[PDB]
Amino acid sequence: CPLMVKVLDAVRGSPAINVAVHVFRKAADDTWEPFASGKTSESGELHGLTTEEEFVEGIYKVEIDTKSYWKALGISPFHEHAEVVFTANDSGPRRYTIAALLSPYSYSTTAVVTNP
Amino acid sequence: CPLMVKVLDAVRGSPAINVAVHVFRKAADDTWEPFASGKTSESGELHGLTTEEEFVEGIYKVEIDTKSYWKALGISPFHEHAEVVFTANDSGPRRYTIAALLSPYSYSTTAVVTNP
Amino acid sequence: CPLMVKVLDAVRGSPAINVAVHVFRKAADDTWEPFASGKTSESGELHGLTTEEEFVEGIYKVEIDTKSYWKALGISPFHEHAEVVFTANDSGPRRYTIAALLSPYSYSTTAVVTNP
Amino acid sequence: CPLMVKVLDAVRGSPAINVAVHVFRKAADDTWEPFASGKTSESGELHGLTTEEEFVEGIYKVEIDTKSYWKALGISPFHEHAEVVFTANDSGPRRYTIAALLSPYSYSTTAVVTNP
Ligand SMILES: C[C@@H](CON=C1c2ccccc2-c2ccccc21)C(=O)O
Numbered sequence A, B, C, D: 001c002p003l004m005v006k007v008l009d010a011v012r013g014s015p016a017i018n019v020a021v022h023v024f025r026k027a028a029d030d031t032w033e034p035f036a037s038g039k040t041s042e043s044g045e046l047h048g049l050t051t052e053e054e055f056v057e058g059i060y061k062v063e064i065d066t067k068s069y070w071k072a073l074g075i076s077p078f079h080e081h082a083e084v085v086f087t088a089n090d091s092g093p094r095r096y097t098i099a100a101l102l103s104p105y106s107y108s109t110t111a112v113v114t115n116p
């Protein structure tokens, strides 16, 4: 599993559950092509987005649908999404964990990158 | 006046100076239209992006060009840029300050929405 | 002038107003001696804590009383307070701005060290 | 395991390994008594600090020795430590994960609290 997304709620001190996540990959014509998507689990994590084989070098965007998450909790947040844009595997395969920490008017995102 | 961007460097404990910032507005066909841009000052701030007249309700994206900032410092970064996407709302406070705190493998962004 | 504290609320996207802040200096017997204190202003800032003359090299602690802030808002918090401990250094820039970004179950703190 | 500490390096996008961690518990006379200590593993995590039985209600302080971590990497950071102070188990036993994200002039800390 070369790509994992983990989402935390800084208001409740909990995983952010059932958060929609969309991954895109930049095409040769510089447009964003759909790559993978899913929803975070009870642990706030989304596994199984891609495989080593599919996850080639490129520029990827992970869009985390934070607005819908907050609205379902009765909160009107500032951001539409949290977006994480990065070049992947440009020095060979790596394992990426994209973590996002959410508040209604602020988010943090951190990448933990390991060499298999 | 209605939109300010402030950028800080968490590695050096300093304003992030000479960071390119691009603002876009979402068009009717869901594309991103260039709206305003500039570079952060010696205080890490970018003022004068827009006017009350022009900054109407709609969806905006602020891209902060973090990769070029870290590359200039000789520090290997993760993200292509930091991306802040939000809906401007006339019902709320009149000033939007988008603050970004930068590290090579992590960034946070906070919206401070106030009435001058 | 040499020490400022700025506090922001990540839930409301606002300055954190009326937050108690206590500054201590480490004594020779390793105890914490009260040094200065105040409450954040309507801009979330606390100025005038100390003077260049008094702010000599040594170890300082800034405690930000976050629990009482969240309790006033009716929001259940995790931390008793946010605590920032550092050594003041004459070799470096002359102004220390301690910034704290607050959520109920998370806080960050950043030092911006500059020359006015 | 009711208490876990996890530490990440925001400069390298990696676990923070071999970081010293000291836990204290406030005594009846309002002094900080040593409670547990250890060092983070290769995964940046510290497990086994305490047991359900020992980890009674109280006010706890987790001190993470971040300065020594950065200095060993050749960096002179701002903070002496990252300190996390919280009341634990005051509504019955909980499981606490204390996470800290480190940069030379900034740190974040987040608590994830679960009901067993
Ligand atoms: C000018 C803005 C504040 O900008 N937001 C900041 C801000 C936001 C997130 C993390 C740190 C900071 C910070 C540090 C020093 C000075 C300002 C800020 C306001 O007061 O509304």
Ligand SMILES: C[C@@H](CON=C1c2ccccc2-c2ccccc21)C(=O)O
Pocket: A006, A008, A097, A099, A100, A101, A110, A112, D006, D008, D015, D043, D044, D097, D098, D099, D101, D110, D111, D112
């Ligand atoms: C990528 C990380 C996964 O955990 N990352 C966390 C993580 C990352 C950024 C901010 C907070 C957290 C956090 C809080 C509680 C438990 C875990 C985390 C790893 O295992 O190395």
